[PDB]
């Protein structure tokens, strides 16, 4: 195991919020 499971999905969660934040600046630049 249980200890490793949120030792993968936490890092995946932080990464996913990070590039999920990047998408809005991508699509903002596309309009410019």
């Amino acid at each position: 195991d249980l200890y490793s499971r949120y030792k993968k999905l936490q890092q995946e969660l932080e990464f996913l919020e990070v590039q999920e934040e990047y998408i809005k600046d991508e699509q903002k630049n596309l309009k410019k």
Partner: protein, 35 residues
């Protein structure tokens, strides 16, 4: 238990990952328009 349910409601965050797949879908949108 302590982390044995924190990990479960942490698995629930894959639904928040699906919104990110919608986001990478949005960046895939208009990339070929600008191309």
């Amino acid at each position: 238990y302590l982390s044995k349910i924190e990990e479960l409601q942490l698995i629930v965050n894959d639904k928040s990952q699906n919104l990110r797949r919608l986001q990478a879908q949005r960046n895939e949108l208009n990339a070929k328009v600008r191309l």
